């Protein structure tokens, strides 16, 4: 995250950090104890993953962090069917032991698809995540997080040269200097309703980070909200 | 529903005699006022419990 702050410890206590081949690679939000859900383009691989939740500061140790093996990927089926649009950016991760939630993990609300709309058009969410703190630069050692307003289908689409599809929208600042950035891929665009934080999009791609007359470009969670419930039940 | 979210915190849905029926996420319930939403689990979703 580019011109963002330092997160308080508990401050989002849903924000998962993955690590595997890299360190601190992509983030991710917790759905439920056994369940993640992150970006596809984390996980094309179906190398070996963990996800360290309760996680604040990754070079020092909180005595709050809880890791755990990732034992199932489901990336959305239609990831992929295209060549590098990111459509689809979406992904579910099984952990191979639940979470134990408390203060400092606990899951982020999903509502329904016509809900988790309208809390988008609200205007104002909230991303976070340990990735680049500037373009080209180093990865943050405390959780980060950005508020960004949302961005308006036509000057999106004029931004750039890329397709932006219905399952995707634009946030930011006309000016530039805040965005989310590379690291931060998986994790959550937030929305808070009267102090009740709903899953309002997933931290997906961009040009760059933070340049002027560019936007971050995420996954509009309301339209695989379905596909999320369905594939996470607990029994 | 059109105003204000009909008061519901969370959800609303209309319904006849033009009112409308409150509800909550999972981890919620639907308080005695049938509009506000509390918490029914010790860790609810969305909650920063911290502070
Ligand atoms: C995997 C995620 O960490 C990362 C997030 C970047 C978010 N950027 C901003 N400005 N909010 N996403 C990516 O790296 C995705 C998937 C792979 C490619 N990609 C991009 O964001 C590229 N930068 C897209 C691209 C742009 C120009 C030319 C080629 C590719
Ligand atoms: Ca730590």
Redesign the interface.
Known sequence: VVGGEDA????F??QVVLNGKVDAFCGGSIVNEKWIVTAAHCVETGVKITVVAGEHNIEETEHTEQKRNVIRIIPHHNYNAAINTYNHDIALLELDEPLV????????????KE?TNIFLKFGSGYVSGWGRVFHKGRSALVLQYLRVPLVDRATCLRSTKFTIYNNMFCAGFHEGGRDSCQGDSGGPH?TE??????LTGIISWGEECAMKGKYGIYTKVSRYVNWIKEKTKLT | CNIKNGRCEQFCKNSADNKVVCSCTEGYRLAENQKSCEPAVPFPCGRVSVS
């Not at chain 1, 308080?8 to 401050?11: E, L, S, Y």
């Not at chain 1, 939630?101 to 329904?112: G, H, K």
């Open positions: 308080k410890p508990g401050q206590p849903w939630l408390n203060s400092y993990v606990t899951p982020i609300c999903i509502a329904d809900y937030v309703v009267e102090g009740t934080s709903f």
